[PDB]
Amino acid sequence: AIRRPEDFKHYEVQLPDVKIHYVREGAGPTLLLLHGWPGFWWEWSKVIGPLAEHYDVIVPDLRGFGDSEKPDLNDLSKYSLDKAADDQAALLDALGIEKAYVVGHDFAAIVLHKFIRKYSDRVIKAAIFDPIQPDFESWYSQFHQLDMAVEVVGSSREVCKKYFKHFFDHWSYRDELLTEEELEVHVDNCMKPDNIHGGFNYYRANIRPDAALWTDLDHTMSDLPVTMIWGLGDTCVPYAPLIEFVPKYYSNYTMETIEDCGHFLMVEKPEIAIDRIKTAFR
Ligand SMILES: [K+]
């Protein structure tokens, strides 16, 4: 089951705006896999290998996450999802890739929504995985606004581990998402300098009342074939609004719920993730 971080081929590029760390492997049309919160590129570890047999898989850490650069922690303009979408275009440019299949998970589903519109000519087909977090202005989005939260959650591995374990588990259909080993890999990443704060900044910069999460361009319609897939979750029914609003911004799409699966499709149901992607992206 586990394929540790060191077991992949790593890279780091200086983009005009930020330094991005990514993992890459495989051959064929390019496949950009984008993570969300909590986590980093590694959440895709179970699915990279299999997908690499048919695609040139690229899995970067979003700015503010993993080994990617954590811009000025006090400058929230550098933590907007708009910047993360620009970073994807910049990455493809640096790697001389004209078009790519893109898969956005959680926060990255928003990045993808932005990207397919701002860089429509750079995407072949896209897929959105679990764009909505379970308990939503949520208690944690508010908690993440506090510096006290950064100071507490990052006070020790013990604490950091308990905190993130809650989200991994609570947001999953089954009782425990990760093995002790896998959870430890996430704690290793979380404890890296500025990673706790960098992740919380995504809430501070984008999930706020006065925060402008959507642009004029985001309101436009997309004919691009998009594949929406999310798990029934630990419960059911907060995805109702999405189901109603999607047709207002997407003309070419599909939706699917995965029974007995939570927020981390690529983690809880690897096989399903791989299957859905292989069928849609061809
Ligand atoms: K659960």
Side-chain angles (χ1 to χ4, degrees):
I2 194 169
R3 215 247 264 212
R4 299 184 66 82
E6 57 267 35
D7 214 50
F8 290 82
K9 301 178 75 176
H10 297 260
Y11 301 87
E12 286 185 32
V13 284
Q14 174 67 69
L15 299 188
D17 269 67
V18 62
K19 197 273 295 159
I20 295 303
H21 163 258
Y22 64 97
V23 155
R24 189 182 184 183
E25 68 179 41
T30 300
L31 213 207
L32 226 205
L33 303 174
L34 308 173
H35 72 88
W37 188 102
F40 59 127
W41 76 268
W42 194 65
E43 79 175 11
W44 299 96
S45 63
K46 302 178 173 180
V47 180
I48 295 166
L51 290 174
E53 289 160 24
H54 309 277
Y55 305 91
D56 156 33
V57 188
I58 302 176
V59 185
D61 273 326
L62 297 178
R63 56 163 69 202
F65 288 79
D67 291 307
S68 279
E69 180 191 350
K70 260 64 68 181
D72 177 6
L73 292 173
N74 298 315
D75 186 355
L76 266 35
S77 74
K78 282 171 170 55
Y79 285 83
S80 69
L81 296 162
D82 291 306
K83 289 322 302 159
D86 290 334
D87 292 348
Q88 307 316 321
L91 212 220
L92 294 185
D93 281 348
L95 303 184
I97 298 168
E98 279 299 77
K99 284 184 176 176
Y101 284 112
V102 187
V103 183
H105 173 225
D106 188 78
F107 266 122
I110 295 175
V111 171
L112 179 45
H113 175 101
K114 297 170 168 290
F115 180 90
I116 68 183
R117 254 151 290 247
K118 189 171 181 177
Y119 306 100
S120 51
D121 59 331
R122 309 306 292 287
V123 49
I124 302 169
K125 289 188 177 184
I128 270 85
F129 283 10
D130 300 81
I132 303 175
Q133 303 189 329
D135 304 8
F136 247 85
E137 194 152 271
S138 64
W139 73 260
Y140 53 92
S141 64
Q142 292 182 60
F143 181 51
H144 294 170
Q145 305 294 334
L146 307 171
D147 282 320
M148 172 273 275
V150 171
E151 296 182 63
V152 162
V153 180
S155 62
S156 68
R157 286 179 69 88
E158 179 211 331
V159 172
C160 172
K161 184 178 183 182
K162 295 191 194 309
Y163 189 77
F164 291 90
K165 193 187 198 310
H166 166 70
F167 298 89
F168 286 124
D169 290 348
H170 179 51
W171 294 5
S172 294
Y173 177 70
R174 70 193 183 208
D175 294 325
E176 291 177 307
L177 177 68
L178 310 171
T179 65
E180 175 74 322
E181 188 189 355
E182 296 172 329
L183 177 56
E184 283 295 304
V185 170
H186 278 281
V187 182
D188 286 345
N189 171 63
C190 289
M191 293 300 287
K192 292 185 180 179
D194 306 329
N195 270 359
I196 296 298
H197 196 161
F200 289 10
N201 271 9
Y202 266 63
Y203 285 92
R204 303 188 179 182
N206 310 277
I207 314 295
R208 246 212 261 126
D210 66 268
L213 178 63
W214 307 99
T215 69
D216 296 337
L217 184 56
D218 282 337
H219 292 97
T220 64
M221 244 270 311
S222 177
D223 323 311
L224 205 284
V226 180
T227 301
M228 286 167 240
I229 304 178
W230 64 94
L232 283 175
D234 28 298
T235 54
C236 214
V237 177
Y239 264 82
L242 189 92
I243 300 176
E244 303 307 337
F245 296 173
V246 169
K248 305 168 180 291
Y249 307 89
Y250 293 89
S251 65
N252 192 347
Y253 69 89
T254 65
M255 298 180 113
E256 175 171 12
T257 63
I258 301 312
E259 285 237 281
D260 287 17
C261 187
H263 194 63
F264 306 88
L265 184 63
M266 71 297 295
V267 186
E268 188 159 17
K269 296 289 178 180
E271 344 76 21
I272 292 181
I274 301 165
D275 177 85
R276 295 298 180 272
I277 295 173
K278 272 183 69 175
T279 307
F281 296 163
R282 61 182 297 110

